[PDB]
Ligand binder design. Structure first.
Ligand SMILES: O=C(O)CCCCN(CCc1ccccc1OCc1ccc(-c2ccc(Oc3ccccc3)cc2)cc1)Cc1ccc(C(=O)O)cc1
Ligand SMILES: O=C(O)CCCCN(CCc1ccccc1OCc1ccc(-c2ccc(Oc3ccccc3)cc2)cc1)Cc1ccc(C(=O)O)cc1
Lengths: 182, 182
């Protein structure tokens, strides 16, 4: 994933737990070698998994719980590290943001085109709910999509209730969520 | 489940969608030979599952979305139909209520002893966070638990984010929810 992602992880860990524990996690992930992540440089995904795996053990916290907190962190982080305009442009509400999300990734994709953005389809079931289809080149990131959704809820002061109803991990085509909101 | 569960589904659908829709759903579930549900009578679980499945078809919403809606409704419904005091006795906050739930079900299990209550274990990860282990003799009600949690937040006027972290239906031992609450 682009370096922005690993910079975001390094940021929330060292914000919440301390620079000491971050370098610990970094050591454990076998990533003591590299000095600082480069935001616009593409990395191989393992660097992210190993950081999340390594953070799980150092913090004695389940990985999915870390992916959840990271998903939520990402929404605020990106607003403040050069992407608040791009965020604001994806829209005014949770349903609209999700509809624009493929378009937003298309924009980001142009900037540096080694981006492999996930696909999000919405089937609105009412004025207050939807079924979200999350299609990814990457495995494991459903818990992060949950956090992302609660991040957007915070962003729009919208209460969100999300339950995962299909599971890529099992061999199903793709993750699916049912969502209810304010 | 005890008939109160099916009366609550009936009430919810009737209130939200009308009695014309309720009948079609009861018809669709193939339960027209049931004139009225009896609250203190133990029914086959299948009756619940069929109403949820058939309501899903009629309303054109995923079962899991209705289960969330239903979990939220249950908190209010039981408050107003004879279990207000029982509910009150289980505490003045979300962490307390959840901690008392195993005892709330003990007292429900003298009225009547054929209750199959789920077990809820809380690991409090801070004063604003819990890991909730939900263990059930039933399948597929995790989304209802999610709704129940949001119902309690409403009840105690507390902001609450629930994220499921482990899923019984994929073959994990029991559902696990991560919960932040203000
Ligand atoms: O399943 C997957 O493959 C990844 C899932 C989680 C990742 N994000 C989640 C999307 C999301 C969902 C809800 C709410 C907000 C979301 O994202 C907002 C966002 C995401 C990415 C960027 C971004 C910005 C610059 C990037 O890199 C650049 C930019 C300019 C020039 C060079 C590189 C890369 C991503 C900005 C805002 C977005 C994302 C992040 C990284 C990549 C990637 O490296 O392929 C692809 C997508
Ligand atoms: O996993 C499962 O197997 C079921 C998940 C969802 C069900 N509820 C969840 C409990 C709950 C969770 C969060 C917040 C509040 C909750 O419950 C409040 C409550 C629950 C049940 C009753 C209740 C009252 C009367 C009952 O039945 C009677 C009453 C009098 C005489 C004879 C039967 C049964 C349940 C009242 C308040 C409660 C429940 C309802 C029915 C049964 C059962 O039929 O076995 C078991 C439990």
């Amino acid at each position: 994933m682009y370096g922005l992602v690993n910079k975001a992880i390094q940021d929330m860990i060292s914000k919440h737990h301390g620079e000491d524990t971050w370098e610990a996690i970094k050591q454990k992930a076998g990533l003591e070698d590299i000095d600082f992540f480069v935001g616009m440089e593409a990395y191989s995904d393992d660097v992210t998994y190993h950081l999340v795996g390594a953070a799980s053990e150092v913090l004695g916290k389940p990985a999915e719980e870390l992916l959840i907190a990271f998903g939520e962190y990402w929404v605020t982080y990106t607003s403040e590290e050069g992407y608040g305009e791009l965020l604001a442009s994806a829209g005014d509400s949770l349903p609209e943001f999700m509809e624009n999300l493929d378009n937003l990734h298309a924009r980001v994709g142009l900037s540096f085109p080694q981006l492999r953005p996930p696909a999000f389809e919405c089937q609105h079931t009412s004025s207050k709910s939807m079924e979200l289809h999350y299609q990814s080149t990457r495995a494991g990131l459903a818990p992060m999509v949950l956090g992302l959704l609660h991040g957007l809820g915070k962003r729009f002061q919208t209460k969100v209730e999300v339950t995962q109803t299909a599971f890529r991990e099992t061999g199903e085509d793709h993750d699916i969520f049912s969502i209810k909101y304010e």
